[PDB]
Amino acid sequence: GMQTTEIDLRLTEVSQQLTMVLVPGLRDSDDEHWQSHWERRFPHWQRIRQREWYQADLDRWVLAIRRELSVCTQPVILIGHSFGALAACHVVQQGQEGIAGVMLVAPAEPMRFEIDDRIQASPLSVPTLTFASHNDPLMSFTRAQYWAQAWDSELVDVGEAGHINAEAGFGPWEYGLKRLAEFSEILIPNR
């Protein structure tokens, strides 16, 4: 990457004070998925685990994120993909403490997973960044705009990026790391 060394230095400093938590969606994030690239690149970043990944169940994802937060010593940034991003949203909306910010990458339309009754179209109590594709099967761009506006999130148009997964080339996704660095630095307690 053109900006790799500067990305890594900046993110290494952010990590001295904030903890990144990776939240995958359905089936987990495979080895070539950006969340997995990022985990290998930043081995101190955290990642949720659970026994079953193949059934969308909001409460299981929420329970996994809660488990993860219970042992965090610093404020967390939740970095979600698809169903994982919905879970990140729901946990913040239900009033979970210890969250500095959330990054929602290709959040799914709640109806696709029959959780339209659990995700509110209302502001998230913390700073939020949302990345939306124009050819994501689970979320139209105009609906991404609707949700971002409702959630009071910044909306980052990544073009035709499919579902923002390995099959689409994400992948190392240095641009996501760059944006994360920008966003997270303003959340650091002592900068």
- Binding site for Ca(2+), by residue number, is 152
Rounded distance, CA 7 to CA 10, Å?
Answer: 5
Known binding residues: 152
- Least separation in angstroms between residue 84's CB and Cl ion is 7
57: tokens are: 């169940």
Contact 25, 83 (CB under 8 A): yes
- Nearer Cβ to Cl ion, position 82 or 133? 82
Please give the Cα distance from 160 to 64 (Å, whole number).
Answer: 31
Q: How far is the CB of 119 from Cl ion (least distance, A)?
A: 13
Of 72-80, 81-89, 97-105, 174-182: span binding Cl ion (CB under 5 A): 81-89
Helices (H), the chain: 4-15, 34-41, 58-70, 83-93, 141-151, 174-185
Q: Which residue has the tokens 């994501």?
A: 136
Q: Which of 14, 21, 25, 168 binds Cl ion (CB under 5 A)?
A: 25
Mark the segment that binds Cl ion (CB under 5 A) among 37-45, 69-77, 82-90, 159-167.
82-90
Q: Which token pair is 144?
A: 């991404």
- The 130-169 site mask, x for binding Cl ion (CB under 5 A), equals ----------------------------------------
Using CB under 5 A, list all residues that contact Cl ion: 25-26, 82-83
